[PDB]
Design a protein around this nucleic acid. Sequence first.
RNA 1: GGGGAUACUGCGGGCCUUGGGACCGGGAGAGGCCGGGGGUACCCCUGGGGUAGGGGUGAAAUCCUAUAAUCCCAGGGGGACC
Length: 133
Amino acid sequence: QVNLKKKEKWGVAHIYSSYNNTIIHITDLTGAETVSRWSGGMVVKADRDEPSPYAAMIAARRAAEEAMEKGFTGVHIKVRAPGGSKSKSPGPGAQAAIRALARAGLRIGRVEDVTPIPHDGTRPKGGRRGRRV
RNA sequence: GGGGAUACUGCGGGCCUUGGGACCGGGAGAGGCCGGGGGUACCCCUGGGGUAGGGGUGAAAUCCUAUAAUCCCAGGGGGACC
């Protein structure tokens, strides 16, 4: 119980956003201790509705209120679209979730598109012609 | 079968330098080969965290996951690719 004068506790919200779901995941400043992890698939029951900025805001609110219960007055943001051979655009859930966090009242610090981009590229799926849908 | 002409072609000889070849100089270039050193990304293993879903679709399911998954963190390894 260190004598905390500031009560400016800062954590990190890692936001995995894709075209199929979104995961809010709040940790300490390191990232090695988790404090809240909420998903579209927790907050709803329709798979097609998992990605939505609706239910993204809800997952964000639940994770936020849990974290600001536990302390953590502010959060840095690390939004992450899927990997290198997959898509490199996050989705709507990202901006929706950061807006939801600000609404919840956590001081949003610095934001970063921490998306793993390859300097080479493994082969992506779909084959030579892609998805012929 | 003879005789004649000699521009062109051929044959022989000689000269030339414009075509081409050689050389020299400073540059250019993802030309090639061989060696070394790296870059993310991805996958697996280990350890820590943290629990109930993840994934995928037009919508779903197969599949993965409560032996602890997805997510996050620290290490190790791997093969491709720049």
